[PDB]
């Protein structure tokens, strides 16, 4: 099962190259309560 | 602190209660200038042999309610925070949120 290498024709280091493409992104939690937190409509919504 | 910790000091306390007079006498003769040298030597080894838990040195006084050794008090016998908690509830006689 392939991954479409955003980098393409990988010549030198495969690991490093991959780590520098969308597959190993910087992933950020959308936490509640604080900063970058507010949701207009919740997961289940207002009742 | 832990229950284990509490148990430890309880054990130590018990040992102290048991062994004190025996400990005391040895201390006394160690102190004594008018005493035999060999006898003194004998006393010192006795003391060395006799339990470490029996000593008042190993007695790290803890909170008598929770178990915290840090923030101990000879007036109340509790943790500082715990004392404060008690105080505010009115559970301590005398202790006023006071100013001077």
């Amino acid at each position: 099962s392939r991954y479409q290498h955003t980098k393409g024709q990988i010549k030198d280091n495969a690991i490093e190259a991959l780590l520098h493409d969308p597959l190993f992104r910087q992933r950020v939690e959308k936490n509640k309560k604080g900063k970058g937190s507010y949701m207009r409509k919740g997961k289940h919504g207002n009742r | 602190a832990k229950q284990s910790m509490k148990a430890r000091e309880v054990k130590r306390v018990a040992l102290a209660d048991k062994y004190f007079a025996k400990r005391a006498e040895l201390k006394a003769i160690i102190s004594d200038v008018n005493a035999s040298d060999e006898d003194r030597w004998n006393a010192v080894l006795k003391l060395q042999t006799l339990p470490r838990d029996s000593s008042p040195s190993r007695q790290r006084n803890r909170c008598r309610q929770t178990g915290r050794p840090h923030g101990f008090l000879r007036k109340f016998g509790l943790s500082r925070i715990k004392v404060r908690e008690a105080a505010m509830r009115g559970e301590i006689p005398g202790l006023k949120k006071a100013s001077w």
Partner: protein
């Protein structure tokens, strides 16, 4: 979270002392601990029966403990044998022979602790928390409380974030030192977490 504990700032002003005994520095700490133990025992025993607080007094090495309760029918019981039994355990805890006195609180909803306990109970048997709080406040108002502030904190309705929720009715002068602020806290051991029920009740101005 910030403020003074009102019962501790008023302990020599309007609030009478919960601990009313003299002991030397040599014999203070241990006595205090014994008292605490007795309190704990009382809490364990009379949680199903409605109790608020106890006042401890020991003259001539013979303790009299004053108990503030809502209903004397379950607290004393049908006979004074249960009371005697209770006393025995207190005596055992403390050292010296024990005597007790009971006090029925007039207007049970005027006292905060009982109300808090009730709220906790409600929370435990799964009722709408907000609604319960509102009901409590209403009851207090009916009873003739000049002011009532209730406050619950955290894990309300099994939410992933803590919920701070509070109702305020009448006048609750937390800053007035001559005010009779009756403040108590009961912390609910719910399935979802711990909810801390805080309650101030303003009784009168003296």
């Amino acid at each position: 979270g910030q403020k003074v504990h009102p019962n501790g700032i008023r302990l020599g002003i309007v609030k009478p002392w919960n601990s009313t005994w003299f002991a030397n520095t040599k014999e203070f700490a241990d006595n205090l601990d014994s008292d605490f133990k007795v309190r704990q025992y009382l809490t364990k025993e009379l949680a199903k029966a409605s109790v608020s607080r106890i006042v401890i007094e020991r003259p001539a090495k013979s303790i009299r403990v004053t108990i503030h309760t809502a209903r004397p029918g379950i607290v004393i019981g049908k006979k004074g044998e249960d009371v005697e039994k209770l006393r025995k355990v207190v005596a055992d805890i403390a050292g010296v022979p024990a005597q007790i006195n009971i006090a029925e609180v007039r207007k049970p909803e005027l006292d905060a602790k009982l109300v808090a306990d009730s709220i906790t109970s409600q929370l435990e048997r799964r009722v709408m928390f907000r609604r319960a709080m509102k009901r409590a406040v209403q009851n207090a108002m009916r009873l003739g409380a000049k002011g009532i502030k209730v406050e619950v904190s955290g894990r309300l309705g099994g939410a992933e974030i803590a919920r701070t929720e509070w109702y305020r009715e009448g006048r609750v002068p937390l800053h007035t030192l001559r005010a009779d602020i009756d403040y108590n806290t009961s912390e609910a051991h719910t399935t979802y977490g711990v909810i801390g029920v805080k309650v101030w009740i303003f009784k009168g101005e003296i």
